[PDB]
mmCIF file of C-alpha atoms and ligand atoms in Angstrom:
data_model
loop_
_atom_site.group_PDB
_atom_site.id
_atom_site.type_symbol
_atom_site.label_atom_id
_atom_site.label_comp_id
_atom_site.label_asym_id
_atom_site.label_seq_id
_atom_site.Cartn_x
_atom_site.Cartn_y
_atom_site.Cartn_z
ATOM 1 C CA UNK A 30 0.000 0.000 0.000
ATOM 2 C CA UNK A 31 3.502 2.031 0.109
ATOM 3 C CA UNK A 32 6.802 2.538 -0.256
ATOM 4 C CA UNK A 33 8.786 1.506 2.219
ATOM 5 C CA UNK A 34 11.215 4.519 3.561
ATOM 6 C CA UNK A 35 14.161 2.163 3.914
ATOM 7 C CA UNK A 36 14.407 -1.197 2.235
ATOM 8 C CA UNK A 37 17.923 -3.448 2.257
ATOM 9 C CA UNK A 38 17.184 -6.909 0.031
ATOM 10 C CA UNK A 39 19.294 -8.898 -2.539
ATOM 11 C CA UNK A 40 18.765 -7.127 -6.099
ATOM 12 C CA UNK A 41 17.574 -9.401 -9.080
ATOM 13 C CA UNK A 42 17.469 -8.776 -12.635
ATOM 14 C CA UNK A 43 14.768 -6.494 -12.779
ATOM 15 C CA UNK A 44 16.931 -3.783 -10.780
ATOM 16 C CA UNK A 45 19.438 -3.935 -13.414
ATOM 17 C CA UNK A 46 18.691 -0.912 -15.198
ATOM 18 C CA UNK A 47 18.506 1.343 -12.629
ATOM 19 C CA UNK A 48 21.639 0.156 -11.009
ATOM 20 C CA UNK A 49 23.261 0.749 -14.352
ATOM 21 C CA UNK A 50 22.289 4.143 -14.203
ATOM 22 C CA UNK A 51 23.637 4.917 -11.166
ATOM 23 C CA UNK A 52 27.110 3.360 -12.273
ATOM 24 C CA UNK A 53 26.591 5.863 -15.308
ATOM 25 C CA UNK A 54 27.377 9.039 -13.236
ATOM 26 C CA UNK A 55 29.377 7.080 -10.351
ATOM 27 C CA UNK A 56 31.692 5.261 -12.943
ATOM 28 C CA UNK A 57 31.417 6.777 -16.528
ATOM 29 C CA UNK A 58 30.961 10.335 -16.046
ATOM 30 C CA UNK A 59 34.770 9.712 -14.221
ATOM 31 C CA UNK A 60 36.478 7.932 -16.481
ATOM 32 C CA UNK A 61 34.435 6.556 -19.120
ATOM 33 C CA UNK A 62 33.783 3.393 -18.215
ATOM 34 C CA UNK A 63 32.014 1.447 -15.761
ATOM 35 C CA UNK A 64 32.529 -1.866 -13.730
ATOM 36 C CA UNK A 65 29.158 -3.813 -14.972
ATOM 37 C CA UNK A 66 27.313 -2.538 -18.200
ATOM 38 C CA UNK A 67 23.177 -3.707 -18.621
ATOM 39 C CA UNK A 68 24.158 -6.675 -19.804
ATOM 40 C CA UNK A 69 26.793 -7.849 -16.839
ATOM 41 C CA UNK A 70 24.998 -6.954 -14.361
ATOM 42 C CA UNK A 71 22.043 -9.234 -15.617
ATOM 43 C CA UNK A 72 24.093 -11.967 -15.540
ATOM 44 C CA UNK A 73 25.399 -12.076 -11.676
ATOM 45 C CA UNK A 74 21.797 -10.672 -10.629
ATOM 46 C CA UNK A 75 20.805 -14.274 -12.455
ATOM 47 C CA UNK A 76 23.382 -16.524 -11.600
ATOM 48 C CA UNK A 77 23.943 -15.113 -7.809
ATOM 49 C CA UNK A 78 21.346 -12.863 -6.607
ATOM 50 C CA UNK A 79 22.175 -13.488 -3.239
ATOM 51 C CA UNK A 80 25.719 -11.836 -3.657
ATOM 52 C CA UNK A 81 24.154 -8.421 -4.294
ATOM 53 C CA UNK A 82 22.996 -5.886 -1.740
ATOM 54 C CA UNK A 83 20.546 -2.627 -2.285
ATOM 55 C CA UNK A 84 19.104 -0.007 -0.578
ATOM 56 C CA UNK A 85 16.084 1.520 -1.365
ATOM 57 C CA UNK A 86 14.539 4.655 -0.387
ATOM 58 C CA UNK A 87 10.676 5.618 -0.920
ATOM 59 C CA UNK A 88 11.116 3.029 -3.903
ATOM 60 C CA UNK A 89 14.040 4.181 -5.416
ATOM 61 C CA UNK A 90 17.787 2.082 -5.768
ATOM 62 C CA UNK A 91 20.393 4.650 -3.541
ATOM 63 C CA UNK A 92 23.122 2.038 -3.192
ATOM 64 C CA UNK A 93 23.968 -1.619 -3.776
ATOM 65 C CA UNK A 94 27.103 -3.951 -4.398
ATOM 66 C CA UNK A 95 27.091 -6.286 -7.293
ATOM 67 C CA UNK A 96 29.127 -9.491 -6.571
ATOM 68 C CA UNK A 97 29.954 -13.484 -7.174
ATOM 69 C CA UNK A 98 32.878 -15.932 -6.234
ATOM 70 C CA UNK A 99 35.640 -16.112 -7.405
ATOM 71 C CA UNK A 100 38.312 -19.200 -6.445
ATOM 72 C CA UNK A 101 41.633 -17.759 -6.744
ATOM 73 C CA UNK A 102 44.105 -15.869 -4.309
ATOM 74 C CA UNK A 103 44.555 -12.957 -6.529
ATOM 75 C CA UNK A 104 42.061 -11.201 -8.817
ATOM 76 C CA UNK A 105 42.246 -11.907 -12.819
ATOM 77 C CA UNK A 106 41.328 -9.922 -16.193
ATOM 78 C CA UNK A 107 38.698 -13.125 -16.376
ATOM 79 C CA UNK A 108 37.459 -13.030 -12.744
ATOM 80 C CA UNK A 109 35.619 -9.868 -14.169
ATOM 81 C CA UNK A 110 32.942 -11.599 -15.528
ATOM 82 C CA UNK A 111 32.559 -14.677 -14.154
ATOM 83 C CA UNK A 112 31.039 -16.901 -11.389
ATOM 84 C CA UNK A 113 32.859 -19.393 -9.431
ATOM 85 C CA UNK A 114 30.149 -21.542 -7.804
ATOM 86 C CA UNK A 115 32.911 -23.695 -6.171
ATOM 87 C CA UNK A 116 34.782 -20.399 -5.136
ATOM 88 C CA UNK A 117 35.103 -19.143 -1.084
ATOM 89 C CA UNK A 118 35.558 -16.003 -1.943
ATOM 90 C CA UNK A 119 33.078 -13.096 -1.973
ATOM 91 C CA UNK A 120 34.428 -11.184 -4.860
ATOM 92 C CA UNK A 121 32.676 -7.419 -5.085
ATOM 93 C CA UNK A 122 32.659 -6.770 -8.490
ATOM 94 C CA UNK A 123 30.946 -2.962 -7.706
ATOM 95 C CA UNK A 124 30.195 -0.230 -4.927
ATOM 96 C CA UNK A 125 28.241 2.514 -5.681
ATOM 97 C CA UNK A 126 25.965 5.425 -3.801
ATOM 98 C CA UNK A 127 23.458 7.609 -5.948
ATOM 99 C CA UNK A 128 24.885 10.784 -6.624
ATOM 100 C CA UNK A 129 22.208 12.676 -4.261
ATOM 101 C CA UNK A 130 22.823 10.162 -1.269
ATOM 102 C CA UNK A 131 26.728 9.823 -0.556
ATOM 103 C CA UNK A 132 28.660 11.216 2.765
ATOM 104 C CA UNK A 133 25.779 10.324 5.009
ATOM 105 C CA UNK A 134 27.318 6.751 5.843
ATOM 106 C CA UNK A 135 24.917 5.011 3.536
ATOM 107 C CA UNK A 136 28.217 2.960 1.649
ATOM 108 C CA UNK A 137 29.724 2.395 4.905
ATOM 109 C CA UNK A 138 26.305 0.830 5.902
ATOM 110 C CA UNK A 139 25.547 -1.137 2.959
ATOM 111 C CA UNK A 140 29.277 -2.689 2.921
ATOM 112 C CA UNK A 141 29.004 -3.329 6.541
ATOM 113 C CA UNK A 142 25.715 -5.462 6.294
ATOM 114 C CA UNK A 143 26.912 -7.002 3.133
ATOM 115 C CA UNK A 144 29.786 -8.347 4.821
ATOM 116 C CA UNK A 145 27.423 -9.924 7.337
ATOM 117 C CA UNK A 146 25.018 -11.024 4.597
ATOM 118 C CA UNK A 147 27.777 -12.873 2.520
ATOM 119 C CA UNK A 148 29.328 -14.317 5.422
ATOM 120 C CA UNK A 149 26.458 -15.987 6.188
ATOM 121 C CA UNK A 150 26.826 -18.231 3.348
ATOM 122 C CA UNK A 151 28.441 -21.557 4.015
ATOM 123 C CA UNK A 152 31.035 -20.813 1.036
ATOM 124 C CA UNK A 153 31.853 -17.699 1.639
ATOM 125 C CA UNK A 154 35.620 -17.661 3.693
ATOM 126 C CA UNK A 155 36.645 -14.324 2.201
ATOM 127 C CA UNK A 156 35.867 -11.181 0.245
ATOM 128 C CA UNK A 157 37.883 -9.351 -2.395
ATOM 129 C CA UNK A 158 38.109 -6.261 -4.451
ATOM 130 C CA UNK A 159 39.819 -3.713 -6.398
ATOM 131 C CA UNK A 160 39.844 -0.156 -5.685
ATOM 132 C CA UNK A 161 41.655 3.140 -6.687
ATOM 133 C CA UNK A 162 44.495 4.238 -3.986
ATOM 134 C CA UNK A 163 42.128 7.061 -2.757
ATOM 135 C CA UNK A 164 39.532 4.647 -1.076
ATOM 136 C CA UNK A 165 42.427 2.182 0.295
ATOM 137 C CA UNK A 166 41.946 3.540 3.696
ATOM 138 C CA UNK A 167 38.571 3.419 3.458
ATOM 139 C CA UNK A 168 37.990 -0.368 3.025
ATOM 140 C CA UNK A 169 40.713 -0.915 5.934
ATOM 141 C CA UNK A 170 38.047 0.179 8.396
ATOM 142 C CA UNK A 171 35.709 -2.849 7.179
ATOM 143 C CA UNK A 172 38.919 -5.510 7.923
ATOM 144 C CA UNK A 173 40.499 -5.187 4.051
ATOM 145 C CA UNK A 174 44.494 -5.464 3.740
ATOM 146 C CA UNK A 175 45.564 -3.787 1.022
ATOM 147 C CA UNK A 176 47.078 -6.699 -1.331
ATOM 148 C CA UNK A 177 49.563 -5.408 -3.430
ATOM 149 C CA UNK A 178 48.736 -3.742 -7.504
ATOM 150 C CA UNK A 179 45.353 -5.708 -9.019
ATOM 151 C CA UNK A 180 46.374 -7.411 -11.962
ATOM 152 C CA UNK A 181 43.403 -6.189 -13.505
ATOM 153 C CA UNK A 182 43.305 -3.516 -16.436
ATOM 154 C CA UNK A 183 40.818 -0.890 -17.107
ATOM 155 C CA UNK A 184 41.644 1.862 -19.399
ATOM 156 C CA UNK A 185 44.325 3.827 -17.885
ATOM 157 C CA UNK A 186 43.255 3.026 -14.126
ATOM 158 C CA UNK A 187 45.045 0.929 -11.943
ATOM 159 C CA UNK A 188 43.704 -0.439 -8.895
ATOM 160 C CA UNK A 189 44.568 -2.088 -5.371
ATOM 161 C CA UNK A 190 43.623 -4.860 -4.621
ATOM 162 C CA UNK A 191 41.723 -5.671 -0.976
ATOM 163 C CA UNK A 192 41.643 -9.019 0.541
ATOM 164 C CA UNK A 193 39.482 -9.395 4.234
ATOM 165 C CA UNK A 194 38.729 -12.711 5.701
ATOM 166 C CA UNK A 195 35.008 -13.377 6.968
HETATM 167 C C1 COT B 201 32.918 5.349 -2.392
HETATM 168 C C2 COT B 201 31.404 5.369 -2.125
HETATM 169 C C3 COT B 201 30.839 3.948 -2.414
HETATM 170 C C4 COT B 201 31.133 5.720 -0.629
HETATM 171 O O1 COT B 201 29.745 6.027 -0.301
HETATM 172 P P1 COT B 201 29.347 7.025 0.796
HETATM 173 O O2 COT B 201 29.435 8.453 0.283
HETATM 174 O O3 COT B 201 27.933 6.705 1.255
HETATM 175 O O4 COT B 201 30.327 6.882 1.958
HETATM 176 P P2 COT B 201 30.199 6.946 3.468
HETATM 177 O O5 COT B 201 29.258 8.094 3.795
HETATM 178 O O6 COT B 201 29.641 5.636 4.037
HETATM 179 O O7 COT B 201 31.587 7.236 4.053
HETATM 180 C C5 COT B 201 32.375 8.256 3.468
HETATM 181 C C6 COT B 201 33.780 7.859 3.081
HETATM 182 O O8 COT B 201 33.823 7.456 1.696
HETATM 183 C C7 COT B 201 35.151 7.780 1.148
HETATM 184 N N1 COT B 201 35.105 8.501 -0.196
HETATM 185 C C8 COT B 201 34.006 9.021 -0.902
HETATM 186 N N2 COT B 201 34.319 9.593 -2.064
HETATM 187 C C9 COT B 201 35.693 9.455 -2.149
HETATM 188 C C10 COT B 201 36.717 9.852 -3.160
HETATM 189 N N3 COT B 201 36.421 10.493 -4.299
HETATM 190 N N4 COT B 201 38.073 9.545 -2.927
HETATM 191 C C11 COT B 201 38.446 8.891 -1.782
HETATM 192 N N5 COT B 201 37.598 8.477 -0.778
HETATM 193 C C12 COT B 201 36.204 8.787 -1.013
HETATM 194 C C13 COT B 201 35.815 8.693 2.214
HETATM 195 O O9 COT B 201 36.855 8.129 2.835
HETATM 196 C C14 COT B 201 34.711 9.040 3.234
HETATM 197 O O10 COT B 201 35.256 9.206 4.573
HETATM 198 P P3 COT B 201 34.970 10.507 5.371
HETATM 199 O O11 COT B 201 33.563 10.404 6.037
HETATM 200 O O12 COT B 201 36.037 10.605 6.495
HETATM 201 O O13 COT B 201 35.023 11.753 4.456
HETATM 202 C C15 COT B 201 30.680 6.507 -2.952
HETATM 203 O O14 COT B 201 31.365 7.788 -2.812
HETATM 204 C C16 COT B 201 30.544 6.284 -4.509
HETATM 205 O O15 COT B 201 29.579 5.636 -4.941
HETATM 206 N N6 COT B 201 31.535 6.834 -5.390
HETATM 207 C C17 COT B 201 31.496 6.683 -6.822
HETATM 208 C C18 COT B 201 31.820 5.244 -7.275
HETATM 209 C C19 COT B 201 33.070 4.639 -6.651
HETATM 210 O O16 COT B 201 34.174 5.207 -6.726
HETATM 211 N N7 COT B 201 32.844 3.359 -6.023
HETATM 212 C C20 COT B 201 33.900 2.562 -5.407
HETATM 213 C C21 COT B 201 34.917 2.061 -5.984
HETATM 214 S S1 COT B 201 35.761 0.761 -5.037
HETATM 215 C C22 COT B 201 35.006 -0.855 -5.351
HETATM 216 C C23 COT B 201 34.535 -0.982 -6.786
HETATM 217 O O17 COT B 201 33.340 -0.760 -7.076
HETATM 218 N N8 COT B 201 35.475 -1.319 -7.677
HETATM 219 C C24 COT B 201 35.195 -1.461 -9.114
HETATM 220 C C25 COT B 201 36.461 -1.060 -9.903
HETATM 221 C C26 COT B 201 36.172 -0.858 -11.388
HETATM 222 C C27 COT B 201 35.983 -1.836 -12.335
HETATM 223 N N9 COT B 201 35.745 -1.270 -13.581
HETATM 224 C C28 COT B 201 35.773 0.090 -13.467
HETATM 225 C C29 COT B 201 35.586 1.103 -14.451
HETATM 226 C C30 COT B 201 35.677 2.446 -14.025
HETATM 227 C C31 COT B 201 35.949 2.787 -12.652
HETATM 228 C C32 COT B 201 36.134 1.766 -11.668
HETATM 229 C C33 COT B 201 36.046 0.394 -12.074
#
């Protein structure tokens, strides 16, 4: 009978598109490119819904993490688009706040609550991602340890990696 004024639940593939447009100012209008396009972000919301995270305000996507598992110690060029189902590791493929809702603690929240969430799962051991240097310090407050350069490419942005154990 109404929106609910705060909603956190696992996205599926119907959320794509909006979540797409948020990575479309929080990714491309930066450095033109984004971590998921419509089409990737389909595909994990398919094969592992329960590794995502939103929140919703009055109806409306603010935040969310888009991730699978991955089953290597280090982060690949391939591990970008695919889904380990044998993997122990939570691998966070994206992180995101809309534009209109950041520096109010809303990531910090959603991260913090996604740790829990994934940790729950009797697979999940770990979770990993790849960040620029700027937000290093940021994921050390969740338990991350920065992990040396990520292999992985993107353009002409290079990225840490962050391992933290669950
Ligand atoms: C960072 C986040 C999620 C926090 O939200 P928030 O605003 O709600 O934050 P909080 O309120 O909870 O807390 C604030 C903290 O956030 C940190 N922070 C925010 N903006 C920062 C900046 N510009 N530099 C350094 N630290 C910053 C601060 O340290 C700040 O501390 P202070 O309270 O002391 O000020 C939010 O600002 C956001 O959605 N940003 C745009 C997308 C993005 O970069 N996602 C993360 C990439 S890291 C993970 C990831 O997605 N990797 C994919 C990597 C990737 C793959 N392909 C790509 C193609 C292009 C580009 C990137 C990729």
């Amino acid at each position: 009978h109404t929106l609910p004024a705060n909603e956190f639940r696992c996205l599926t593939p119907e959320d794509a598109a909006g979540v797409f447009e948020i990575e479309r100012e929080a990714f491309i209008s930066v450095s033109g490119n984004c971590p998921l396009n419509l089409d990737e972000v389909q595909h994990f919301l398919t094969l592992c819904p329960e590794l995502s995270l939103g929140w919703f305000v009055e109806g409306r996507l603010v935040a969310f993490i888009i991730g699978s598992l991955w089953d290597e110690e280090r982060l690949t060029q391939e591990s970008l688009a695919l889904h380990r189902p044998r993997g122990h590791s939570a691998h966070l493929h994206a992180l995101a706040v809309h534009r209109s809702f950041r520096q109010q603690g809303k990531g910090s929240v959603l991260l913090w609550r996604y740790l829990h969430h994934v940790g729950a799962q009797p697979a999940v051991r770990r979770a990993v991602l790849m960040c620029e240097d700027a937000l290093v310090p940021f994921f050390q407050r969740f338990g991350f340890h920065p992990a040396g350069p990520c292999a992985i490419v993107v353009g002409s942005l290079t990225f840490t990696e962050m391992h933290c154990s669950l």
